[PDB]
Amino acid sequence: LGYGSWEIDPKDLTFLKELGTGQFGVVKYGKWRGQYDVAIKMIKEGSMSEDEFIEEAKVMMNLSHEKLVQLYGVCTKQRPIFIITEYMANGCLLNYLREMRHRFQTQQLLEMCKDVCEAMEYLESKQFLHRDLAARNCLVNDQGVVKVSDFGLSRYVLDDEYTSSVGSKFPVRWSPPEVLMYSKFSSKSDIWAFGVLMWEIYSLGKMPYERFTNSETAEHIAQGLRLYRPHLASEKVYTIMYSCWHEKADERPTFKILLSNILDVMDEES
Numbered sequence: 001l002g003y004g005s006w007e008i009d010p011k012d013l014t015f016l017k018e019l020g021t022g023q024f025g026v027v028k029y030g031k032w033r034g035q036y037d038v039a040i041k042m043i044k045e046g047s048m049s050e051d052e053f054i055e056e057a058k059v060m061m062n063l064s065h066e067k068l069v070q071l072y073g074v075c076t077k078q079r080p081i082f083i084i085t086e087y088m089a090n091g092c093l094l095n096y097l098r099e100m101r102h103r104f105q106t107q108q109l110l111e112m113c114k115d116v117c118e119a120m121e122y123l124e125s126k127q128f129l130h131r132d133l134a135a136r137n138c139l140v141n142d143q144g145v146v147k148v149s150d151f152g153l154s155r156y157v158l159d160d161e162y163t164s165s166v167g168s169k170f171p172v173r174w175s176p177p178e179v180l181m182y183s184k185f186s187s188k189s190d191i192w193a194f195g196v197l198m199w200e201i202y203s204l205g206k207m208p209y210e211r212f213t214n215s216e217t218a219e220h221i222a223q224g225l226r227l228y229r230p231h232l233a234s235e236k237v238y239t240i241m242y243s244c245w246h247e248k249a250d251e252r253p254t255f256k257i258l259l260s261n262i263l264d265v266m267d268e269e270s
């Protein structure tokens, strides 16, 4: 009584560990009904357009793919509201990449790219944009599988420093020229970001354009210059990520085409 299909009873949650603090505040690890691992976003007051998100959560619930971090439900009766998601034991892809001890083989790096590409192909098939695809917004489970996280939530951020294209928190380094110039988001801006994500993976989580500021990056990419080949990327892998950065959005591949290209390179580089 008093819960829709989207609604989780917060009394069913056991809080176990703090995972960190992001754009909407603290996120914790816990259990649901004593036995199911979950992550719990405790949505900071003022940080989210909550009513709009709650309506969208109904759509997000139905986005189900193995390589997408699942939304399990929301707790909306109380302030702060909670968002309950799939838990990922190996944490953020960016941090995971930066842990040199893993000493990833290039086949593992390509598999990470494929994991993300599968998730993104699924989202593309639902005409659903991520809008902030980057290694920091991917997660890794205890089997080393990478999944895409927090797809679509950018739409509900109430922080001008995140939303404004000249804001301090805006993902300049993952954005195509038409986003930077006209804030024109499309499937093809997710494609561009995916190419940068591939670059992050093969660079083991270096900052894209690490020697530039955001402002200098915007200027660089408007002049047609690009990231260049990470040491661990083969020429074939580099060709794939580079294909994501065509100046003309309509000349960039789809995620289906990228997936096919990644599978081909796996077959050629096994």
Ligand SMILES: Cc1nn(C(C)C)c(C)c1-c1nc2c(-c3ccc4c(c3)CCCC[C@H]4NC(=O)c3nc(C(C)(C)C)no3)ccnc2[nH]1
Residues within 6 Å of the ligand: 019, 020, 021, 022, 023, 024, 026, 027, 039, 041, 085, 086, 087, 088, 089, 090, 091, 092, 132, 137, 139, 149, 150, 152, 153, 154, 157
């Ligand atoms: C990390 C981490 N380390 N470890 C070990 C290895 C030490 C573990 C187990 C984790 C871990 N973390 C998660 C999370 C999670 C997701 C998002 C976030 C957080 C945590 C908090 C950190 C800040 C970003 C934070 N962004 C957000 O909440 C958000 N960003 C957005 C954007 C795009 C801005 C729209 N929307 O929500 C979810 C599911 N399983 C997890 N496992």
